[PDB]
Paper text:
GapR (growth-associated A/T-binding protein involved in regulation) is a chromosome structure protein conserved in α-proteobacteria, and it is discovered initially as an essential nucleoid-associated protein for normal growth and cell division in Caulobacter crescentus (1–3). Depletion of GapR gene in Caulobacter cells results in severe defects in cell growth, cell division, cell size, DNA replication, chromosome segregation/condensation and gene expression. Our current studies clearly demonstrate that free GapR is a tetramer, but not a dimer. Taken all together, there exist both major conformation and minor conformation for free GapR in solution, which are in dynamic exchange equilibrium with each other.
We report the crystal structure of a 10-bp A-tract DNA bound by GapR in an open tetrameric conformation, which is representative of the minor conformers of free GapR. In this crystal structure, each protomer of GapR is consisted of two α-helices (α1: residues 13–51; α2: residues 55–89) that adopt a V-shape conformation. The open tetramer of GapR can be considered as a dimer of two antiparallel coiled-coil dimer-units formed mainly through α1 helices. The two dimer-units form a tetramer through further dimerization with one α2 helix from each dimer-unit in an antiparallel coiled-coil conformation, while the other two α2 helices are free of contact. The tetrameric interface is formed by hydrophobic residues V57, V61, I64, I78, L81 and Y82, with 6 intermolecular salt bridges between residues K60 and E74, R63 and E74, D68 and K71. The 10A DNA is partially wrapped inside the open tetramer of GapR, which adopts a C-clamp like shape. The binding of 10A DNA is mainly through electrostatic interactions between the phosphate groups of a 15-bp DNA portion and side-chains of positively charged residues of GapR, consisting of K34, K49, K59 and R63 of all four protomers, K42 and K60 from three of the protomers, and K56 and K66 from two of the protomers, according to interface analysis using PISA. There are no base-specific contacts between GapR and 10A DNA. Therefore, the major difference between the two tetramer structures lies that one tetrameric interface of the closed conformation is fully dissociated in the open tetrameric conformation, while the other one is rearranged to form a new antiparallel coiled-coil interface. Therefore, the crystal structure of the open tetrameric GapR should be considered as representative of an ensemble of dynamic minor conformations, which should be in fast exchange on the NMR time scale.
Numbering used by the authors:
A (entry chain B), D (entry chain D): 14 to 96
B (entry chain A): 13 to 92
C (entry chain C): 13 to 94
Write the structure that this text describes.
Amino acid sequence: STAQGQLKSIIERVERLEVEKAEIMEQIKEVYAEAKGNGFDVKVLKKVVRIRKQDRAKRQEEDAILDLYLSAIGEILEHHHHH
Amino acid sequence: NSTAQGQLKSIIERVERLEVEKAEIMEQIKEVYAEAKGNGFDVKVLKKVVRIRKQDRAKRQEEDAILDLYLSAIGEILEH
Amino acid sequence: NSTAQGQLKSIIERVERLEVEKAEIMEQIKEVYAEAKGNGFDVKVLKKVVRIRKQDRAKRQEEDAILDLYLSAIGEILEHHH
Amino acid sequence: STAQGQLKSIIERVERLEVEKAEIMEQIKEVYAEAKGNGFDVKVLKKVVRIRKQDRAKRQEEDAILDLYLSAIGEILEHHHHH
DNA sequence: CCGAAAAAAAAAACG
DNA sequence: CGTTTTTTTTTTCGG
């Protein structure tokens, strides 16, 4: 039936995507293992990745607000030029 | 603290790319579930179905692992 | 602040006693495994057996939970035709 | 055989102990939940409990070193009670 | 936001 | 010692 087929496609797509996600997580562990093999401190590395992630989030908030300012300026410009 | 730092950069950049890909996957999963809800499905029940199937596969590999432990223990006893 | 201080110490003290008890339990578990090891058992295999049995109990609990979801969803569909 | 019975008592004792352990973890979680219900921040509470645990480890190590000093002094005292 | 469920990070046991 | 699981903290995600 159509509902059985929809169910099957849902479970199938989710399970494939989660396979891919597990592959990504495993590759990340590969990078950390190689970093450790070259003498790096994995724990501080993970802390660095977390900190850079947090700073990146702040920058994106700043960029969205920045775009608000740019939008208001854009309206002021179009109004200035015509009339 | 010189020529290791160039490698450090490759490390962090590779990690950041991989986590980008990971977030893209998570987003696709969320999209599939939201479309399922839009087609009248209960996302919570769907996730429980996926969860149980995942646990069953994990158990099956676990039992393969205990089997391998048994065969190894026997071989260790018989070799020495 | 002030009045909360009496509650704070009672909380931390009860939790810390409970953590004492939990650590004592972990010690007893290690004792059982060590004595079995002294009797020739393979501790790793034993832990795997305990772990598999626990996974079976978890799986059965999950099956009961999804069963309840099915029953509730059926009740939802039927009770909201009227 | 006797090894079958030993196996069974082992598995049952461990499983009984892990039952007890899960009940204790539940009591801890409940205490934190009611504390939160009284307006506390659970995360900071857990951080404090962890810090006190770390202090307890530090003091017990230092107390063991203290015992080394006390024992050596005791040896000097037994030597003294001879002169 | 909450409460459960996944994942990351931290801690510890085993050889 | 270190590694390779276990335990805890942090994060996710639907409601």
